[PDB]
Design a protein around this ligand. Structure first.
Ligand code: F43
Ligand SMILES: C[C@@H](OP(=O)(O)O)[C@H](NC(=O)/C=C/CCCCSSCCS(=O)(=O)O)C(=O)O
Ligand SMILES: [K+]
Lengths: 248, 563, 433, 564, 144
């Protein structure tokens, strides 16, 4: 068939980037379905998924050769709302970086709407489908709950100096260290919730450095990843040349 | 030491208000960690002034106004410490709040001074008088014309009786000067009216301007600020033409309304007119003399730093970045095209804390030493790739080595703008080539994205990703020499972080080498200390107004309202 | 000449060995018929005029003029009005004028005779001759007196000429007014995505095709298909918009149950390698290999097809349109990372998609996919290879958007969808070769 | 009875003003055909003297020639005839013409800023978006929190982020948002500080008529800062509004701060739910929305608020409308935006000074009311138009002829033609309730006037005049237009002084004392608000107070951030 | 075009870009440029395209083939296809390199697309741009 190569580079950062692209990521913690739903803030934990329109089984869909061959996701078939999960990841070697959360979405999940920014990365999907994606990113090495947070608003922190306890600042204090583990007692837009979710011990600085997809000069310098730089320069050169004359 | 050492020490190792940054929250500029004291807005005297004003407004008017407690979640700003800004190249320290265009009179006046200005030829008008009426035009007739024009231009009567006039006390910022390549005319016109090219420009620059303009003559017209604020940019050439036309009637003893006056109207309003820019398309509909129509070459030529200090072309580029980024991002994109809190901090990297300055000086030193001086690097893909890559790596590593700089430029858009200004500016200065500078800007962005796994806000790199391929495209709506791109070049028409940066890249292709980038008439028009805003030193004006000490604001209604 | 096979919206081979030059807007008879047909067509809301008059809601945007209400039984008299409009719009009895009542006489389709567009600068006679004919026909049919005639006129024409367009009026086209063009050649690119999905009755392949025909005809009018661009444009048009070689529909079907955006990227690279469009170039120490192409036009056209495949499978999976912005971005970003070759339109699809994502998920402007078009400042930047995906995505909505074609496009969709070649353009284009 | 202008003519021509000697040497009876020309120069007039002294000080301070009355043509300064004052019509406020130039009169500037900085924005579609896409429940309580936050944020303050720059409240205290609604429960349950209460602001018949038009729908009346509208332009208003509306929905409904539903709320605020004051105009005169060229006469008439305060005097409603509209269209728009310099103050002052147009319009209304049996009762026919227009025109012509003082005040034929046609058109529209009939009368008046005096206005005054009669009832593409929807971009009207504000008064006359609005209940209700800086119910009073430099509601100054 | 390039007077309205001057013998090579533009503007060899050098090679008349206006919304392909054909023909005739090609393009097209029209350019019609229409049907009425 075809075996994807994903991305250049031989550094740990490049290898971690290929892990995130390919969903080859280690499960680090367990988060219950109801705890995740509580943190997301879109419905009561355990409750039925609200609908924005009727289930497809109750709708007369237009005749369309594409609809005939593209299977709806479970959330689309059910008429779920489009809801989201949004993450902020510290530039001090959080495991994830925004574009790579989006590549993880686009490569590995059907029916995604990812958005990449510097201080936030978001994915909108039919609600039940979104929860499957959110759980995977939340439970695996892609999220360190000290260096990252779930933040649907008021995201400030990715580029700020870390707190003295090593955790990334949250203006809204949705999650924090308590007894050596990260705990969270607010939903992702800052609304207090009636539970306290245990999100595990944060990674040490040394483990973050080994798992990060971020290039940082005193860990794995971007300058040292000669393959990635050569790749960038090649794509730039070809885009430039073909914009003048579109000929090999 | 890096150029931003002092500014980072001011911001992160000295008290500001009662933010405790002189004590418990003090940091070394390399520290990766800090304290979050959650003092709220009361740590910052400026915020406290704003809060007390807001509460007084609510009470006086009976309708809710500003209240920091109305932040989302009822958690007020100042959870992190609130820290200051230093105007780059200066020791002026202020709050970000002192730099919003709404709160900074010098910023408003910069835009008013552009909006209210046009350049208008004299040669076609004089030819009309000579041919149609047989009039003789001399320095004496021109001098009387200019005396009457300066009385009339602010809105005073020449011909009729029992007339209403604008009040001089409200319009003292309105006037007309002339400039000319005709050296004899330059000397015979009364000096009060003349922008003397020899006096205002170093000899080499004066020679280059005179070569471009030949023996032609021009009026530099500045209509009243109170008018430009009441009206819009398209009102400027119209106001000018009314009073030019009235003055020709009197100074040449015409019928006060004959066919020759109509040909003088077409001259002033169309054939002889140089506006700052033309109209823009319907979705963003505006007429001439608005920021969307302002080309980057015109904006670079408005800025006057190159005639005062061409020996520091990097400083020329940085001052250009300051004036242009303020206008394009704060007033235009953050005002005209959006609004609200707007885009002060997207723009402040161009003129605060010495960070972009550090990176651009570094890239220029790199390229100057390597290629044998400014302007001497060949404009090729290999030159562009080298300067852009090395400058980008320097900037990224600086943010990584100095956490204070990363925290100041907390948004990726800010960081991407800063580094691409440095990479594009260093390349343009090295090559003397605006297109090469644009190509470097885009390569920088692409490297930056891969280094950090992020770039700017959601929509930052629209133009970025179209960028490399469109530098040397010849397509209808893609091909354009850099100097003639502007805020309506299609890919550039929406987003912060770019327009003022490109203006600085265009300036970099000419700074210290040429007297102007695209228009010697615009360049010469603004070479005038009577213009309220100091286009040679925009940073100093921004800073003086940040302190509420800048004294050249025009257009107020104070004279005709109670205290 | 490059030759392609043309396939239907469901993967049936229609024509074999077609010279790509024969699908050019400059040669294909069906493209000429569709474009000139659209220029000639206007929608009349007879029910709308009757309601505007009864409620004196003259000029729209909240307006009402007290005392100027008029009760005319327009819809009940639709047959007489259709006849009169036909006679007023025609140039000669028996010419190519069409006037037909639709939906119980609530609407008319008008197609002005061709000469009114041939001997004219642009397309607007379809709006103006229709609005004048309707106004005259109503004045006559209902014996309206002089002092009331301006009320009829403003009910039909809206606020024109105080406004540049017929704001609050009842005569419309899928094309907007020429003064709103962003630049030269943008008129045919100013058709809202929702209008296209309604015209094609939400068949995603046909919506993509109609949009691609208009976008690529626009690229020609922009002057951007001359010389060293012509073949390049025709390859990407045929491969993205006309299902050339069944690449779009066949890959969509193969990926339709389990495929993601990444699956579509990989399928495109796989097909390009198998077809000898790209081949391994430089192998790095990690094992990563860059790729080179022997045919930029063909590689680009494969990427254009793949961008649409990814749209159809990802938007189809959501049964919603909004993700199309992300699809166009990530398909192209990822294919560049996979190959070290430029993505579709050399970054311009990705770039349009960056701004389109922002302007469909933020406070600043834009909206849902349905409001975009090739003339929109946000989505204009690709040379015709982005908006056809946007329109297809709209077609796939099962009910998520507020500003859907049902809300924005009922009149024009009802009228334009009645025209077979507009609604079924793939069939028409292939039938002409 | 004595003509309404008797007092004003006595003030102007039989009482001293400055040292003009009109109280003695140059005193006249208001019917005298002759007077003295004393050639006193500008020094007879304290305002001119103040201006001359300021000009000389500017010349000296800046080293560049400024105002000097000696630079008049021939070196003969103004004031060869005596310089005489103006009385604001309906008042005892006496001032110079110089106190009424838009540049010199802060109330005139604020009138325009208050229109330019305003838009109306629906709430229903936004609430529907929240309900459908997110499943949110919208209640009076959620709306009240939304409106509290919106009034904090609209002037330019932060809601979601941290370490933010904000506009200074001291500079933006004129910016706010209110709501109005036809839903009576919502009107009661929203916090009263935010509500334009239709029942409290309008007489019961007008309130009922507004509520019938608006149904149960709900609207935001948004006024962005004056300092911003002055820095920017009219097209900036809806954009500013939409940014802060969007931010407030994010917080008030706990949305992702940037999700697809926010984009549909953006389209709602900026397009589907938006009522601007007017739209863009063509390239030759290129401007975007919310500029005077795009302002329809119906909207301008609806902005003026006299009809909700004093519908029992419909002529006064028409006259106040003529005043506010003529100032804007002739002084600021045609005399500013579209030209400039000394401009067009005196082309406009007949609408609001010396009680002359007022005399003529009261006369025409009394004629038509008595003849046809009251306002609104005359059939809208050629015969009605011909009668009212001809008799009102003859009255006005004969008045100028009987009273040389009035002819000398309205010294330009354009002024006279505007005055008489306002009277003829306004009387016809009031009699018939019909804007088209009023326009037909306006043109017949002009034609009679030209023949009577052998002159009409300035060189280009009657372009629209001569196209006028034939275009009143034309249905042609760019000619047909109901009167209420005509405006400053109707083709024939796009250039010339003396008409736009007059037509606005004719449109108002077709509705004054009969209907709550002319064309848009949303515009009408938006401006029914005493917090708006300019008093749209009594524009004449505001013009006059500001002519005396006593009007104290100017917004937008930079005083707070500059030195004394 | 030749003078615009030689004086770097790119965009008109007083402009000059120092350092970007280019000396091309365009008028002397008008016959070769005519032939190349003819090949670029036509759709099929032998169609109704006209390209003719006038007045000593100082000008061309171009009449685009009818299909470029028939299968199009407006008339503007006469301007755009001509400007593109001339730009490409000059780049080819004079072997212009990539870094200089935007200079050629802006000499031909003027300030477009920063401006809506080809301000300072060298391709013109008697008809003005459709965005300047005062209303519907005014394009053929906008001839000076
Ligand atoms: C609501 C949006 C979505 C949108 O359409 N615009 C927002 C908000 C808007 C508001 C925020 C005002 C407020 O706090 O109430 C304003 C000021 C525009 C306005 N309406 O006046 C703005 N952003 Ni935003 N916005 C900014 C930025 C940013 C950065 C902030 C990252 C961080 O770590 O804090 C990110 C984008 C990114 O991640 O790259 C961002 C996103 C966002 N930006 C998210 C909210 C983020 C959050 O939930 O915290 N902005 C910046 O990167 C710096 C400049 C700063 C702008 C203010 C100024 O220039 O003075 C402001 C520009
Ligand atoms: C796109 C279009 O809006 P429309 O779709 O409503 O016509 C257009 N608006 C704009 O282009 C707006 C440009 C300025 C605002 C956005 C600048 S990018 S900086 C914001 C980034 S973040 O802080 O939110 O992350 C207009 O004409 O108003
Ligand atoms: K203004």
């Amino acid at each position: 068939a075809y075996k994807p190569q994903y991305y250049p580079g031989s550094t740990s950062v490049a290898k971690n980037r290929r892990k995130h692209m390919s969903d080859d990521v280690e499960k680090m913690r367990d988060i219950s379905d109801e705890d995740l739903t509580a943190l997301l803030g879109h419905r009561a934990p355990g409750s039925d998924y609200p609908s924005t329109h009727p289930p497809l089984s109750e709708i007369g869909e237009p005749a369309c050769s594409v609809r005939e061959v593209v299977e709806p996701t479970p959330g689309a078939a059910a008429g779920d709302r489009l809801r989201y999960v949004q993450w902020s990841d510290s530039m001090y070697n959080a495991p994830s970086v925004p574009y790579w959360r989006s590549y993880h979405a686009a490569i590995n999940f059907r029916g995604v709407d990812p958005g990449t920014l510097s201080g936030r990365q978001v994915n909108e999907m039919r609600e039940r489908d979104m929860e499957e994606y959110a759980k995977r990113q939340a439970e695996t090495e892609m999220t360190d709950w000290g260096l990252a947070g779930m933040r649907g608003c008021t995201v400030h922190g990715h580029s700020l100096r870390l707190q003295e306890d090593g955790v990334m600042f949250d203006m809204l204090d949705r999650r924090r260290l308590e007894g050596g583990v990260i705990v969270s007692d607010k939903d992702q837009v800052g609304v207090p919730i009636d539970r306290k979710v245990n999100l595990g011990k944060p990674m040490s600085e040394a483990e973050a450095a080994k798992r990060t997809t971020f290039y940082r000069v005193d860990n794995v310098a971007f300058r040292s990843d000669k393959e990635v730089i050569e790749h960038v320069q090649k794509v730039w050169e070809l885009r430039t040349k073909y914009g003048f004359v579109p000929k090999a | 030491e890096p150029r931003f050492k002092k500014s980072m020490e001011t911001k992160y190792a000295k008290e500001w208000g009662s933010n405790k940054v002189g004590s418990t929250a003090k940091a070394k500029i390399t520290d990766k960690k800090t304290k979050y004291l959650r003092l709220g807005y009361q740590q910052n005297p400026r915020k406290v002034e704003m809060a007390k004003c807001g509460a007084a407004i609510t009470k006086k008017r009976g309708l809710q106004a500003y209240d920091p407690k109305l932040h989302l979640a009822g958690i007020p700003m100042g959870q992190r410490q609130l820290t200051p800004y230093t105007i780059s190249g200066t020791d002026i320290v202020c709050d970000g709040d002192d730099l919003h265009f709404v709160n900074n009179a010098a910023m408003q006046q910069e835009w008013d001074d552009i909006r209210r200005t046009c350049v208008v030829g004299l040669d076609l008008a004089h030819e009309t008088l000579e041919k149609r009426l047989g009039k003789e035009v001399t320095p004496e007739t021109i001098n009387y014309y200019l005396e009457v024009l300066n009385h009339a231009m602010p809105g005073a009567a020449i011909v009729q009786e029992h007339m209403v006039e604008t009040h001089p006390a409200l319009v003292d910022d309105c006037y007309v000067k002339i400039f000319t390549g005709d050296e004899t005319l330059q000397d015979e016109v009364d000096k009060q009216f003349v922008i003397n090219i020899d006096n205002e420009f170093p000899a080499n620059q004066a020679k280059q301007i005179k070569a471009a303009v030949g023996k032609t003559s021009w009026q530099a017209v500045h209509i009243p600020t109170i008018v430009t604020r009441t009206e819009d940019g398209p009102g400027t050439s119209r106001w000018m033409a009314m009073q030019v036309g009235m003055t020709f009637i009197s100074a040449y003893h015409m019928c006060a309304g004959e066919a020759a006056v109509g040909e003088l109207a077409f001259t002033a309003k169309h054939a002889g007119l140089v506006e700052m820019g033309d109209m823009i398309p319907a979705r963003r509909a505006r007429g001439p003399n608005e920021p969307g129509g302002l080309s980057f070459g015109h904006m670079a030529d408005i800025v006057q730093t190159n005639r005062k200090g061409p020996e520091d072309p990097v400083n020329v580029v940085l001052q250009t970045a300051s004036a242009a980024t303020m206008l394009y991002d704060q007033i235009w994109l953050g005002g005209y095209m959006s609004g609200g809190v707007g885009f002060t901090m997207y723009a402040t990297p161009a003129y605060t804390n010495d960070i972009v300055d550090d990176f651009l000086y570094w890239g220029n030193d790199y390229a100057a030493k390597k290629y044998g001086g400014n302007g001497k690097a060949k404009a090729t893909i290999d030159t562009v790739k080298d300067i852009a890559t090395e400058t980008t790596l320097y900037g990224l590593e600086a943010y990584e080595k100095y956490p204070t700089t990363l925290e100041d430029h907390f948004g990726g858009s800010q960081r991407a703008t800063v580094i691409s200004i440095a990479a594009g500016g260093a390349t343009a200065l090295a090559t003397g080539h605006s297109q090469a500078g644009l190509s470097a800007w885009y390569l920088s962005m692409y490297l930056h994205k891969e280094a950090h796994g992020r770039l700017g806000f959601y929509g930052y790199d629209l133009q970025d990703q179209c960028g490399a391929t469109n530098v040397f495209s010849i397509a209808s709506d893609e091909g354009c020499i850099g100097e003639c791109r502007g805020a309506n070049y299609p890919n550039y028409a929406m987003n912060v972080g770019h327009q003022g940066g490109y203006t600085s890249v265009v300036a970099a292709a000419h700074a210290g080498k040429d007297a102007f980038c695209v228009n010697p008439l615009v360049k010469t028009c603004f070479a005038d200390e009577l213009i309220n805003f100091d286009f040679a030193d925009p940073r100093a004006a921004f800073g003086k107004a940040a302190l509420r000490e800048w004294d050249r604001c025009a257009g107020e209604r104070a004279f005709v309202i109670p205290a | 000449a490059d030759t392609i096979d043309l396939y239907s919206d469901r993967g049936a081979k229609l024509k074999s060995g077609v010279d790509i030059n024969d699908i050019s807007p400059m040669r294909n008879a069906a493209i000429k018929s569709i474009v000139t047909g659209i220029k000639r067509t206007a929608a009349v809301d007879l029910a709308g005029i009757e309601k505007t008059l009864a409620t004196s809601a003259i000029g729209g945007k909240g307006r009402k003029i007290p005392g100027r209400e008029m009760k005319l039984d327009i819809v009940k008299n639709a047959a007489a009005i259709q006849k009169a409009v036909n006679e007023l719009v025609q140039v000669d009895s028996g010419d190519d004028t069409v006037v037909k009542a639709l939906n119980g006489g609530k609407q008319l389709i008008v197609q002005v005779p061709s000469v009114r567009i041939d001997v004219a600068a642009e397309y607007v006679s379809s709006l103006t001759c229709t609005a004048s004919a309707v106004t005259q026909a109503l004045v006559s049919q209902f014996n309206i007196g002089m002092f009331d005639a301006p009320t009829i006129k403003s009910a039909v024409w809206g606020q024109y000429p105080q406004t540049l367009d017929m704001v609050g009026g009842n005569v419309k086209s899928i094309v907007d007014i020429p003064q709103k063009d962003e630049g030269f050649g943008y008129t045919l690119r100013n058709v809202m995505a929702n209008h296209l999905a309604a015209t094609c009755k939400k068949s995603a392949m046909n919506t993509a095709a109609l949009c691609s025909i208009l976008e690529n005809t626009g690229v020609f009018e922009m002057g951007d298909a001359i010389g060293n661009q012509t073949r390049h444009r025709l390859l990407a048009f045929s491969h993205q918009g006309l299902n050339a070689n069944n690449l779009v529909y066949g890959t969509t079907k193969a990926l339709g149950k389990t495929g993601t955006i990444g699956s579509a990227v990989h399928a495109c690279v796989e097909k390009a390698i198998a077809d000898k469009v790209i081949s391994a170039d430089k192998k790095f120490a990690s094992g990563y290999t860059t790729y080179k192409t022997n045919d930029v036009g063909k590689w680009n056209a494969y990427c254009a097809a793949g961008t649409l495949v990814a749209t159809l499978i990802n938007c189809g999976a959501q049964r919603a349109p909004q993700s199309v912005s992300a699809v166009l971005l990530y398909f192209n970003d990822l294919i560049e990372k996979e190959t070290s070759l430029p993505g579709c339109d050399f970054g311009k699809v990705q770039g349009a998609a960056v701004g389109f994502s922002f302007f469909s998920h933020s406070i600043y402007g834009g909206g849902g996919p349905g409001v975009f078009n090739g003339n929109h400042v946000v989505t204009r930047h690709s040379k015709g290879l982005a908006v056809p995906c946007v329109a297809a995505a709209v077609a796939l909505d099962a009910g998520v958007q507020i500003y859907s074609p049902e809300k924005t496009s009922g009149l024009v969709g009802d009228v334009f969808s009645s025209v077979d070649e507009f609604r079924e353009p793939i069939k028409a284009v292939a039938g002409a070769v």
